[PDB]
Design a protein around this nucleic acid. Structure first.
Length: 111
RNA sequence: GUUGGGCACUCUAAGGUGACUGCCGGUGACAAACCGGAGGAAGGUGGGGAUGACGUCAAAUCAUCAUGCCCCUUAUGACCU
């Protein structure tokens, strides 16, 4: 649900998200990255602007540069990013056919 | 510590070493960089003080001092209370 702002700064009508009724995204594919004490995953859907925090026990074997599926445990809240767990490792992002395989996982196509 | 007690530690202060993106992940010209690893007291210009250029104000000082020419020169010298 979106509240309608009285003033628009442009041609189109502006609005603010007041409430979330239904959550669409529950899985996110991306590229895993390893920091010192925690992971992240950079989402292939760039419409997800924020990097998904992976806690160290959610890594499940994912190395640097591996395309990974990630299940959302939490959503973003304030300035905190979304956290998750690596559900699947696809492989490395430079391996032939992982590009397409990443698509197959992004939509949730049958294996 | 008061005393014997080597003197360990601490302190004192001479002489050294120590940080360099050096090394390791990513990233990116395969480089630089950047992001984050470690190690270390210290992390990415260690932190402070010291040491700049050519400037102009005929800026200020003859009550720092000195000073060419003036003036005072039994006083514009000097001494006391």
């Amino acid at each position: 649900m979106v509240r309608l702002n009285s003033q628009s700064s442009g041609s189109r009508q502006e609005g603010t998200v007041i409430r979330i009724l239904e959550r669409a995204i529950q899985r996110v594919v991306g590229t895993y990255t390893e920091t010192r004490n925690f992971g992240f995953v950079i989402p292939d859907d760039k419409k997800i602007t924020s990097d998904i925090f992976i806690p160290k026990n959610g890594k499940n074997g994912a190395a640097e540069g591996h395309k990974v599926v990630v299940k959302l445990t939490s959503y973003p809240e304030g300035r905190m990013n979304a956290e998750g767990e690596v559900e699947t490792i696809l492989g490395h992002k430079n391996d032939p056919g992982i590009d397409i395989l990443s698509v197959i996982h992004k939509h949730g196509l049958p294996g």
